[PDB]
């Protein structure tokens with residue numbers, strides 16, 4: 001059944017064979033499918049024999065504690081299964097070194113860059129939405145959710161419009177390969193692309209993200225072209241699949257809940273709070289760490305080299321962290337989640353992501369206030385490191401919409 005044999009140190013009462021790439025209840029919705037790990041008969045910390053065999057922490061308190069404890073729970077191997085070539089920076093690095101590359105990456109996506117970009121972000125959203133508005137329909141995932149983050153990256157990185165189809169193909173192969181290329185081939189292709197641009201902006205710098213990363217200082221010396229390509233790499237792929245799929249869950253829910261749409265139409269000042277609460281409800285990342293040594297964690301013996309999945313998705317859904325966690329309530333006094341992670345790798349794009357989400361909601365709801373799922377359509381989710389939405393066919397009446 002693809003169950004790896006149970007390591008001898010793992011007690012049988014801790015075994016719960018969850019499959020993170022194919023969970024049992026997927027058709028109920030992917031968050032609901034993962035929430036099974038939080039039923040009361042399910043221990044706080046379990047081992048699944050799926051996918052090579054690995055721990056899962058199922059409660060927000062454990063998830064946070066392990067993300068904090070990078071000395072036991074290392075990022076050198078963050079993906080399950082173990083045999084899954086990933087050299088992006090700073091994602092596979094622990095502190096101390098991680099902190100250098102992080103401060104550099106922060107100069108390109110940090111809050112003040114985000115404030116600088118806000119209306120470029122709005123102008124992109126408006127032109128995307130305006131072109132769909134008179135059609136009375138779209139595949140949201142395909143027609144807005146994908147083109148939007150990749151266009152934001154071209155803006156940040158100072159890259160030409162004409163490169164978008166090829167860059168999007170390459171990033172698409174990394175996360176949903178059609179078979180043309182291996183992951184390594186897509187990566188090297190991506191590197192082929194970025195190397196000359198980095199070399200040149202080392203020499204004639206702009207005020208764009210590649211210029212900033214190329215001309216950076218690590219541990220007292222300049223960044224190597226290799227380190228630069230591997231950072232620039234993460235800056236591209238880190239903001240695509242997450243944003244594309246998050247925007248999709250959020251639009252799917254809004255299309256299914258006219259009352260929540262109405263609330264934001266009538267009170268657009270609530271849109272930043274609604275953004276936070278959507279990020280809790282439709283959280284969607286689950287990566288992991290590797291044990292640096294033997295370690296007893298909450299009464300459970302963990303072995304050096306064990307992988308442990310620490311699902312960022314699960315902290316906000318945990319009923320010990322938020323009451324009625326499946327209920328969407330834009331007025332939650334305390335929205336608690338780890339949707340952007342927790343600890344030293346906390347999402348560097350978190351400020352860019354919130355602006356992307358806020359602007360999307362504000363702009364869509366004012367131009368196309370009333371929209372629904374396409375009659376007959378059943379929305380299908382998918383599950384993995386980044387869970388998401390397969391497609392989102394939306395429809396509206398063009399007469400009910402505003403040219404702005």
Ligand code: HEM
Pocket residue numbers: 078089090091092098102105109234235236238239240242243246284285287288312339340341342344345346347348349350352353
């Ligand atoms: C809904 C949108 C997003 C979500 C849910 C999300 C989620 C996450 C999570 C959970 C991590 C930490 C992973 C770990 O600890 O192993 C992370 C890291 C990171 N994210 Fe995001 N992210 C989003 C958007 C973005 C965007 C728009 C960018 C900008 C390009 C970005 C850039 C990064 C980078 C560079 C890291 C590495 C931080 C480090 O290792 O120090 N993210 N993100």
